[PDB]
Amino acid sequence: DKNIIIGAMTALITPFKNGKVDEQSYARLIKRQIENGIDAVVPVGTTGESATLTHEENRTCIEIAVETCKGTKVKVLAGAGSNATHEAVGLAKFAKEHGADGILSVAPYYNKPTQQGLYEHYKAIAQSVDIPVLLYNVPGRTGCEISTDTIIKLFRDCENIYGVKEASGNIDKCVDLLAHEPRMMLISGEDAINYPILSNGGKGVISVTSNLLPDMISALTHFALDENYKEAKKINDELYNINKILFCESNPIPIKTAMYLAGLIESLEFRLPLCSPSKENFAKIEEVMKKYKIKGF
Amino acid sequence: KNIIIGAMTALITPFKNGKVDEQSYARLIKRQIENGIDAVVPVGTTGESATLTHEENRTCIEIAVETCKGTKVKVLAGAGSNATHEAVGLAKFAKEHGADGILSVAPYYNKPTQQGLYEHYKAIAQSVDIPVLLYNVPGRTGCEISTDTIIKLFRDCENIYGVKEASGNIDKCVDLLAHEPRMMLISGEDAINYPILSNGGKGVISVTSNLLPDMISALTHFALDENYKEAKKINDELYNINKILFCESNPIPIKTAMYLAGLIESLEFRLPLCSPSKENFAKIEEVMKKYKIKGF
Ligand SMILES: [Mg+2]
Numbered sequence: 228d229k230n231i232i233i234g235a236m237t238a239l240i241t242p243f244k245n246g247k248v249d250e251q252s253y254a255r256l257i258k259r260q261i262e263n264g265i266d267a268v269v270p271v272g273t274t275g276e277s278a279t280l281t282h283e284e285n286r287t288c289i290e291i292a293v294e295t296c297k298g299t300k301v302k303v304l305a306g307a308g309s310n311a312t313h314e315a316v317g318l319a320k321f322a323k324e325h326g327a328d329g330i331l332s333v334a335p336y337y338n339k340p341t342q343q344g345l346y347e348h349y350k351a352i353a354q355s356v357d358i359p360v361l362l363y364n365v366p367g368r369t370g371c372e373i374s375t376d377t378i379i380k381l382f383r384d385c386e387n388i389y390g391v392k393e394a395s396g397n398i399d400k401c402v403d404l405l406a407h408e409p410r411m412m413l414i415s416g417e418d419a420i421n422y423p424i425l426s427n428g429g430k431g432v433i434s435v436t437s438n439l440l441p442d443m444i445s446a447l448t449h450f451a452l453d454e455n456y457k458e459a460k461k462i463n464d465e466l467y468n469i470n471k472i473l474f475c476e477s478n479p480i481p482i483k484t485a486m487y488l489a490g491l492i493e494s495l496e497f498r499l500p501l502c503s504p505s506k507e508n509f510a511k512i513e514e515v516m517k518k519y520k521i522k523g524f
Numbered sequence: 525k526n527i528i529i530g531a532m533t534a535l536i537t538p539f540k541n542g543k544v545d546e547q548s549y550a551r552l553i554k555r556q557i558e559n560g561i562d563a564v565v566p567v568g569t570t571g572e573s574a575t576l577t578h579e580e581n582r583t584c585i586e587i588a589v590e591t592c593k594g595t596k597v598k599v600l601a602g603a604g605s606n607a608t609h610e611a612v613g614l615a616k617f618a619k620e621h622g623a624d625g626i627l628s629v630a631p632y633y634n635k636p637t638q639q640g641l642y643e644h645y646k647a648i649a650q651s652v653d654i655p656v657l658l659y660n661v662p663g664r665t666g667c668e669i670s671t672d673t674i675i676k677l678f679r680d681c682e683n684i685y686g687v688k689e690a691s692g693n694i695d696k697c698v699d700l701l702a703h704e705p706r707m708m709l710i711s712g713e714d715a716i717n718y719p720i721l722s723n724g725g726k727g728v729i730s731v732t733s734n735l736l737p738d739m740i741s742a743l744t745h746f747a748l749d750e751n752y753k754e755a756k757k758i759n760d761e762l763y764n765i766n767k768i769l770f771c772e773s774n775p776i777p778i779k780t781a782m783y784l785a786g787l788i789e790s791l792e793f794r795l796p797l798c799s800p801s802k803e804n805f806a807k808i809e810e811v812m813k814k815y816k817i818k819g820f
Pocket residue numbers: 277278308
């Protein structure tokens with residue numbers, strides 16, 4: 228029916244060098260994701276520090292992702308959202324112009340639209356492009372919730388809206404969504420509960436942990452999609468300690484720390500207001516990493 | 525320190541035919557000045573900062589500065605961002621265009637750590653020489669500026685003189701002023717204006733004052749003179765309107781009330797904000813009839 232983008236996906240960190248996007252590191256990281264079974268990559272989402280990138284840096288990250296996935300089956304689901312509808316429409320059109328296969332569009336943050344407003348927000352975005360649109364609910368960061376009813380109405384009313392990324396630690400809501408609209412693509416945005424979401428019929432993940440451990444997240448998701456739930460849970464359980472420690476400080480502070488500790492990025496750099504973890508949490512991230520096998524390039 | 529305190533208004537931004545109604549905007553500010561308000565906050569949360577262009581942000585601050593000249597009324601410009609580089613540029617822009625100080629909201633959405641918030645605000649304060657009021661509203665931003673961070677920033681940065689609190693947490697208000705009694709605690713929560721003032725807060729940055737500027741100004745002034753019996757009377761009388769103004773997300777109710785009072789021409793928002801439900805529209809209309817609303 229609808230065009231979809233599902234499976235194992237990575238919310239890419241954006242590496243910085245001397246305060247600039249390391250464009251070589253970025254392309255190299257994406258290649259490493261492709262080679263470890265990932266099905267799609269998400270440039271400039273939350274994990275990519277979308278908030279602190281200039282518009283040209285946003286274009287650059289998206290274009291590099293498109294260019295690096297050419298010749299592969301891996302799709303580019305571009306972070307393209309904003310708490311201003313006029314801007315979100317513009318960011319959607321631009322992501323499409325630069326070759327993105329679809330867009331991930333975060334619910335408006337800070338200004339707390341009502342459900343009616345969220346509906347009109349996403350309807351305007353979806354009308355402005357002809358590529359798939361994945362809603363993105365993360366109430367702990369936005370201060371609002373796209374309700375089940377709103378999500379289901381948007382899925383049914385707008386042809387290119389095909390599912391939602393849930394980062395709301397609410398398995399009840401995941402049941403609610405797929406019990407009333409089994410045709411939508413529920414996507415886990417919370418690594419520690421990837422398996423519970425997939426086993427209730429979710430069709431993919433947009434992962435933080437896959438930045439560090441893409442082969443494990445790929446295998447988990449693919450097992451689950453193959454209905455080999457036993458093997459998916461085994462990996463989900465193994466990943467629990469790292470899944471949780473990657474949120475000991477606000478994402479992406481721990482994941483960038485882990486990537487640096489693993490030698491996968493050259494510098495532990497953020498853009499303010501993000502900064503390096505405390506010494507104690509730095510030490511905890513390094514401790515948890517010890518029992519995982521981290522792929523190189 | 526240099527401070528901006530007293531009774532202050534988070535100005536709504538009126539729209540007409542999709543554009544900032546610039547004449548309405550100046551007229552609304554004049555009405556605030558004429559009803560005892562001590563400062564105006566253009567382009568904060570209540571003014572829908574998130575959906576204004578950089579040019580409209582500029583126009584709004586410039587109209588505020590120009591309308592307040594030759595009066596005591598100060599311009600405490602909304603100027604914050606979840607990107608530190610952009611918050612610094614917004615702070616510089618506000619100063620260079622004549623604002624008396626800035627209100628800078630805690631970074632929303634990307635949830636910086638307390639170290640991150642310290643460095644964020646330290647960067648902003650070092651960029652201008654005008655007063656900076658922090659703004660804590662965890663229900664909208666997803667983060668909380670802790671008491672220790674607020675106190676550290678106040679003691680380490682000359683321009684930082686207090687915090688607008690919109691967190692429903694009177695324990696924290698006590699914590700702040702018991703450990704750092706020199707800061708200016710500013711109520712960002714109309715319903716508890718008097719409790720914050722009576723614990724030593726020195727002003728309000730009000731939503732309700734858009735509609736009832738004389739009442740909020742009296743409340744504040746009674747309280748600052750330690751006429752607490754009178755300030756509590758107004759706070760109690762205002763509770764019903766203070767609460768109904770958040771039956772939907774601010775500023776959807778206050779704009780609806782201003783429109784119903786004939787104070788703005790059109791009930792227009794920028795998406796993702798929009799008109800209230802029919803029921804909430806009716807409820808706003810009913811609560812307003814208990815209050816005397818000053819015209820122009
Ligand atoms: Mg963003």
